[PDB]
Design a protein around this nucleic acid. Structure first.
Lengths: 307, 187, 123, 113
RNA sequence: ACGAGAACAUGCGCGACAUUCCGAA
């Protein structure tokens, strides 16, 4: 059996959905320094009962049911920040492109409390990028990531022009490396063959779709900001919000100038209220696309293999 | 005829999942997840057979010698008895953090790209199960070789998964052997 | 149980564009309630593991978080708020806290499960 | 009897596609409550047995909601109404008769497969 | 002063042997 150690370098913010979403109640959002400290409910309730303010919290929630921010409540009560750091689970950085924290999708994490990315996401991405019963190619989960690195990145849509969205996806900070152990047999899947397939698929996905963004001024601004690293070469887009065209078997299967039309039809089917109204095929299909000045793209990850 | 007992720990490195009739297998008395001895024995037997047929009773002679054979006219008693691995009390106290967690998989289709979300209950990583195995010395001379095979199987089980969908990051385990002593006999 | 009448009152029928959806409320989605359902699932699994005749203090803290989540869900959608008003889940969690016993908590959990089961059946 | 008649009427696939795997949960609950009643020697169903029968009724409702075949089985066989009758009469003989009716129902359903 | 009187249907014997609730996302 061929065992390979796989290094994933998250050159871009990547957010894997954990199946749950939390509003401002579950975390404190400092707006002056723009930092989000994720907290758990029972410790917050215990501290509030200790200070005799749980009923005040209930009344505040009753008055601000739609928008109840824990940071604003703590500021109103003027209780010690040492207690804030005592009852909090862990702190994280906030990056916005424009705004308060309203609806955060949490990142997938294990039961203990550490964060990681599942191997099922890697399996699905690899299968959907290879096409265009996977029993031999077995992928395990990733090693835990340091919690301080994890942050909340903004989701920005570039319709020939960048525009941040109110939705927040709890992505992973750049420069973080995660590890995988993957077992393959030489009979069915070849490491060189699969990595060459991945890089070739990323290359054609770049040239038939991302070139259209490059020609438009929004893609030029994104390139000027450094969204695409110079290495971008095995590249994956594992997290959510990267976009439909990334690692699409339908793109690969159909020839250019025809695959884009089919992708446009698929997008019309999926988004009837947005893409369904659109009827003409643009130059690029689809047309949609940190505190540091350097820009990054959603889900960009670099692949390293060591057999 | 000597009974040698191998007692140790199986610590899960990923989400352990055995699909009890997506729930996981639990002991009714303690309501804690367990690793059935049948699952472990089947995994080791399959891995060792792959390392070394329609009826599943043909295999290779070492496999029937170790894990038993119901062959017509060649019924061989199983020298390996793999018992249910129960949730460790030390690991339970360490968690006392739920023992099991639910993982969500969108399972998006290819052509229509329509998600069909599903939930799978898997034991959290770092949990431990106390495992107990019995080896019966049917022939004194072969025991060494048998144990060699056993070691190989263990190695394979450490490189492979145990239960659930292991190709997606489930069932990865690690074996820590505490003691191997001849409980019955003079071996 | 007596949840039959509550679910019957809470059950409505929606129609639009020739499609007839049998859902109690517009916002009564299985996941929106399922968040609190899984919170109660964690609570009662902890209760099962503890196997104690009295409601544990840590269970009480997760339960207070459950009340916080109840107010959260009432704020999130008017449908969940009206469902909670009809079912009076707050009164049941209050009695569970006050009498502080495993049997009462189990009865309340069974009643809430009956509510969700009748809601699913009437769908 | 009545079970034979209802199973024959729903035979065409029985009860819109009902199998034993669909019913196994209800069968397990029913036989558990049956054994608990069997161990006790009383003409009236005890309070915990009454609560377990209420739980069995809500399990019937949950299984009807989950599956259409189970739902039409419950509707045609009057099993929930029979559970209500057993609760109202609170007699061990009536509960044993209901258990025998359910067992005959399952036996005939397996027979016509 | 009963076709009667004495006479264990009883001794030995594992419902047991092989079987991953798994592939797929």
């Amino acid at each position: 059996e061929k065992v390979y150690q796989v290094k994933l370098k998250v050159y871009g913010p990547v957010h894997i959905g954990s199946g749950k979403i939390i509003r401002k109640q579950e975390y404190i959002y400092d707006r002056r320094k723009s930092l989000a400290h994720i907290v758990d409910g029972p410790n917050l309730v215990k501290f509030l009962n200790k200070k005799g303010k749980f009923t005040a919290y209930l009344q505040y929630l009753n008055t601000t049911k739609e928008r109840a921010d824990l940071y604003t409540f703590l500021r109103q009560e003027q209780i010690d920040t040492n207690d804030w750091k005592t009852f909090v689970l862990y702190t994280e950085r906030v990056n916005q492109g424009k705004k308060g924290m309203n609806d955060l999708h949490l990142f997938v994490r294990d039961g203990r409390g550490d964060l990681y990315i599942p191997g099922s996401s890697l399996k699905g991405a690899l299968r959907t990028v290879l096409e265009g019963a996977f029993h031999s190619l077995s992928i395990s989960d990733s090693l835990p990531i340091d919690p301080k690195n994890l942050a909340i990145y903004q989701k920005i849509d570039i319709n020939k022009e960048l525009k941040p969205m109110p939705l927040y996806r709890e992505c992973v900070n750049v420069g973080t490396t995660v590890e995988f152990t993957m077992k393959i047999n030489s009979d069915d899947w070849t490491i060189e063959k699969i990595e060459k397939q991945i890089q070739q698929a990323y290359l054609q996905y770049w040239n038939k779709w991302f070139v259209g963004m490059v020609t438009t001024p929004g893609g030029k601004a994104f390139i000027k900001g450094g969204g695409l690293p110079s290495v971008l070469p095995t590249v994956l887009f594992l997290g959510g919000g990267t976009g439909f065209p990334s690692k699409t078997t339908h793109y690969l299967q159909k020839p250019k100038e025809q695959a884009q039309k089919d992708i446009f039809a698929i997008l019309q089917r999926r988004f009837r209220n947005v893409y369904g109204k659109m009827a003409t095929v643009p130059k690029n299909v689809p047309m949609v696309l940190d505190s540091t000045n350097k820009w990054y793209q959603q889900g960009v990850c670099l692949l390293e293999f060591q057999p | 005829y000597s009974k040698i007992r191998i007692v140790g720990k199986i610590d899960v490195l990923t989400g352990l999942h055995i699909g009890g009739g997506s729930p996981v297998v639990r002991d009714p008395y303690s309501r804690l997840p367990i690793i059935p001895g049948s699952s472990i024995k089947g995994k080791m037997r399959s891995l060792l057979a792959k390392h070394i047929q329609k009826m599943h009773n043909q295999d290779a002679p070492e496999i029937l010698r170790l894990f038993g054979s119901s062959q017509k006219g060649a019924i061989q008693s199983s020298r390996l008895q793999i018992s249910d691995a129960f949730f460790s009390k030390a690991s339970q106290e360490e968690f006392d953090l739920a023992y099991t967690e639910t993982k969500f998989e969108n399972t998006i289709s290819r052509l229509t790209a329509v998600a069909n979300p599903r939930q799978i209950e898997r034991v959290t990583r770092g949990a431990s199960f106390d495992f107990h195995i019995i080896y019966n010395v049917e022939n004194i001379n072969e025991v060494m070789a048998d144990f060699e095979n056993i070691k190989t199987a263990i190695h394979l089980l450490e490189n492979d998964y145990l239960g659930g969908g292991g190709t997606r990051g489930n069932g990865r385990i690690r074996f820590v052997i505490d003691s191997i002593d001849t409980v019955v006999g003079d071996f | 149980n007596f949840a039959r009448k509550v679910v019957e009152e809470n059950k409505r029928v929606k129609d639009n564009r020739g499609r007839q959806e049998i859902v109690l409320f517009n916002g009564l989605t299985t996941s929106k309630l399922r968040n609190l359902l899984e919170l109660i699932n964690h609570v009662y699994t902890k209760v099962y593991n503890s196997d104690d005749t009295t409601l544990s203090e840590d269970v009480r803290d997760e339960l207070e978080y459950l009340k916080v989540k109840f107010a959260y869900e009432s704020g999130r959608e008017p449908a969940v708020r009206t469902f909670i008003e009809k079912t009076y889940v707050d009164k049941l969690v209050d009695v569970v806290l006050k009498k502080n016993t495993k049997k009462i908590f189990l009865d309340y959990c069974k009643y809430f499960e009956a509510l969700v089961a009748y809601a699913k059946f009437y769908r």
